[PDB]
Design a protein around this ligand. Structure first.
Ligand SMILES: [Zn+2]
Ligand SMILES: [Zn+2]
Lengths: 158, 158
């Protein structure tokens, strides 16, 4: 199951949605938390809107983004942070991370009320280039920004 | 104002076409050869085919590839190698490099018959993941490969 986290935002020429899923078995091994040690996969779905000012066609996945996350259980105060990594599934690329929830004994990450924040930086931080000549050039990149979501976490999708 | 280089190749779930155009100005600075030192901008246009085996939607740009090129003037025997870098223009993302031809201080890269080779490695080299679970997983990435083109360079179009 895919559970939507809050409502998707249209910001800075992109549609930015958050969902969580069952833990994802991913390769290459070692880069991310193993699926068996996780309770969910947190995903950011980020695609260009129409009239994207940085030259991305409508619907294209936005690549080379840096996406940090903060996940807060507002009931318990438990907080965890990390970064999502780029990967591909049978239905296309996304940003994601396996996350231990109930499995994490270092904090109160069980069923409850959560706040999720993404801190998103533009592709130039990873060295992705942009044409700036008059003939082929595009608009300047957005400055780093945050999007916030509130959701109820009800357990690993079933 | 793109000049086609040879015939496009379809392999490993991708269409791989090459074009050149006038030199472009890229940010961030100090990575790509400066436009004034160049004669052309070489581009690799790489998009998913139908039924891409790694889950990329048809038409999507293929991101996180490592791509080198070798360019050989078959008339003079002059050969140069470099890297293509990911970037976005007003027509979307591509891999490209500004290249000195007539302006190459070594000489031998003027108007003539050329062989161009791309050497391409998969996204895992750059930390890109893939789902491997039964429900949403995708197959292995291609091993490093090359594709070859033949074309006539008719001079700097700047
Ligand atoms: Zn994933
Ligand atoms: Zn370019």
């Amino acid at each position: 199951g895919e559970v939507p986290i809050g409502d998707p935002k249209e910001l800075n020429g992109m549609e930015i949605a958050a969902v969580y899923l069952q833990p994802i078995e991913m390769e290459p091994r070692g880069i991310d938390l193993a699926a068996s040690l996780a309770d969910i996969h947190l995903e950011a779905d980020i695609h260009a809107l129409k009239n994207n000012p940085n030259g991305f066609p409508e619907g294209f996945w936005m690549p080379y983004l840096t996406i940090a996350y903060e996940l807060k259980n507002t009931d318990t105060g438990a907080i965890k942070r990390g970064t999502l990594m780029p990967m591909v599934a049978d239905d296309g690329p996304h940003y994601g991370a396996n996350i231990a929830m109930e499995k994490d004994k270092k904090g109160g990450f069980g069923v409850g009320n959560y706040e999720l924040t993404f801190y998103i930086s533009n592709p130039e931080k990873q060295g992705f280039g942009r044409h700036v000549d008059e003939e082929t050039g595009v608009g300047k990149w957005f400055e780093p920004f945050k999007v916030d979501y509130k959701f109820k976490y009800t357990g690993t999708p079933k």
